[PDB]
């Protein structure tokens, strides 16, 4: 039995820096969800998601959910820096009753929801240089109203268009107005997208409406960190190997507890 037929049942906080999501998913903390304020600028070598995690903000979705989840996991850092964009002619800091922060109507802490200014929301030409030597990760969104009335009162534009572009890439999104089942008393949605701006490349935003603007970038280096889903508690112990069923000593050359591992782990074999 060089295979450890049963695991510890708990995950050791050592040596790998373990960050428990608890009531938060990585994406909710990435966007900044009211209950996820305590995850800002917080690093991790391994980030454990829980089955009990929800979202308590303004409903959204991500088309390529698996790419963005693996980006933030590989970097191991939620450190963003706020950059001052030039949002002349628009109303900033849009709030909603479905995203309650500090017992008040708020929004995602890292997203700026843009509405019209005096019923005029111009075409926006915005440039961001990225003078650094490391890949920036921008998180932006597109709001899908429920009616043509809602589209008009929010952006003063029946057909909004958004075109996030760099010297290398070019993304265009079109809103989708329509009646949608209420989510926490909200029939509207938001579509989340991401854009990597490489060093020396320029970020260009051309928008006419329905834009959930980003407030900053994130630092990505595709490091050693990763992400795992588990329900085993986090205990006070030291163990090189970590599995969704708990920590595991790495003294035996094989293992069958789970095919997902992290760190100095024995090679997996089946039952």
């Amino acid at each position: 039995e060089l295979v450890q037929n049963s695991s510890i049942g708990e995950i050791c906080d050592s040596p790998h820096q373990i960050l428990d999501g608890e009531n938060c998913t990585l994406i909710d903390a990435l966007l900044g969800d009211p209950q996820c304020d305590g995850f800002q600028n917080k690093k991790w070598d391994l980030f454990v998601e829980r089955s009990k995690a929800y979202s308590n903000c303004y409903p959204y979705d991500v088309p390529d959910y698996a790419s963005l989840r693996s980006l933030v996991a590989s970097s191991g850092t939620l450190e963003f820096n706020n950059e001052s964009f030039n949002w002349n002619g628009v109303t900033q800091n849009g709030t909603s009753s479905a995203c309650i922060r500090r017992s008040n109507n708020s929004f995602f802490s890292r997203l700026n929801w843009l509405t019209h200014l005096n019923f005029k929301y111009p075409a926006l030409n915005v440039t961001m240089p990225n003078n650094e030597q490391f890949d920036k990760l921008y998180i932006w969104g597109v709001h899908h109203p429920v009616t043509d009335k809602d589209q008009i009162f929010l952006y003063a534009q029946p057909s909004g268009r958004i075109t996030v572009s760099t010297k290398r890439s070019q993304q265009a999104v079109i809103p989708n107005i329509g009646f949608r089942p209420r989510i926490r008393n909200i029939p509207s949605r938001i579509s989340i997208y991401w854009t990597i701006v490489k060093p020396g490349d320029i970020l260009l935003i051309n928008s006419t409406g329905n834009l959930i603007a980003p407030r900053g970038y994130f630092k990505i280096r595709s490091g050693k960190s990763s992400i795992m889903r588990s329900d085993a508690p986090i205990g006070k112990c030291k163990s090189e190997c970590i599995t969704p069923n708990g920590s595991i000593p790495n003294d035996k050359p094989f293992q069958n507890v789970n095919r997902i591992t992290y760190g100095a782990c024995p090679r997996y074999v089946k039952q």
Partner: antibody
Framework: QVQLQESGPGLVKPSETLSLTCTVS????????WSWVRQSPGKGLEWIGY???????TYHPSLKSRVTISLDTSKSQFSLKLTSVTAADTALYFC?????????????????????WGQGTTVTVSG | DIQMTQSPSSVSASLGDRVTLTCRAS??????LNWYQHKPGLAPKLLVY???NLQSGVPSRFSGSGSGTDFTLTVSSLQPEDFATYYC?????????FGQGTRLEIKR
């Protein structure tokens, strides 16, 4: 507002092909899907199949090849057809507006809600 | 291929009481389930999207919960105008199997 109106025969002789027609009122299409369900006398609701605005249908595997649903945005109408009908097909058929979404908290699979419904068209299959 | 089961089948509960209807699943669904309100001769109306997520025109006295295979609806104070017959769907797989239905009796 939004309302639905099924239209079709009230009686179909056995082995024939049912053909009902639902109607769009005053609502946008786009991401909506369009399903029908047949209510039995008391057996319980049974789902039939649903088409996207693009025109890609999926049946209910209980009806092996018996269902063919269609769509035509020119008249804002879409029909469902049941071939080789037998006495087991007596039911009360509805048409409903389904909305396909991916909720934020869990991305694991798709959600589906029948936001809008119609009153029903009683259909009997007897000789 | 994939069914569910809603308990009870038909139960009477007086005016002002508090009734709970439970939908049992074959496999864990997380929150891929829905609830509807079906009245005599009328089109069924949505009550619950996902779980505990209410629709327009639904009072706060309705409230559901549950995860995995077990989900419940709870009418805090039963009112006569509600009544109806209540179902659950399995919005997770392709058959989209619907619940058998639970009759609500006013009993007042």
């Amino acid at each position: 507002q939004v309302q639905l109106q099924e239209s079709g025969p009230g009686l179909v002789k056995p082995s024939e092909t049912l053909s009902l027609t639902c109607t769009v009122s005053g609502g946008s299409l786009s991401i909506y899907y369009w399903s029908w369900v047949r209510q039995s006398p008391g057996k319980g609701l049974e789902w039939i199949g649903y088409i996207s605005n693009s025109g890609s249908p999926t049946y209910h595997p209980s009806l092996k090849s018996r269902v063919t649903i269609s769509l035509d945005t020119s008249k804002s109408q879409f029909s469902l057809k049941l071939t080789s009908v037998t006495a087991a097909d007596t039911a009360l058929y509805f048409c409903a507006r389904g909305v396909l979404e991916q909720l934020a908290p869990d991305f694991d699979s798709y959600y589906y809600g029948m936001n809008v419904w119609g009153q029903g068209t009683t259909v009997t299959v007897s000789g | 291929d994939i069914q569910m089961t809603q308990s009870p089948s038909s139960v009477s509960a007086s005016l002002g009481d508090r009734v709970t209807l439970t939908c049992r699943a074959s496999q864990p669904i997380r929150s891929y389930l829905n609830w509807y309100q079906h009245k005599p001769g009328l089109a069924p109306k949505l009550l619950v999207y996902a779980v505990s997520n209410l629709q327009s025109g639904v009072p706060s006295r309705f409230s559901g919960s549950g995860s995995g295979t077990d989900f419940t609806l709870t009418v805090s104070s039963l009112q006569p105008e509600d009544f109806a017959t209540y179902y659950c769907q399995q919005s997770y797989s392709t058959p989209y199997t619907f619940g058998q239905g639970t009759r609500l009796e006013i009993k007042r």
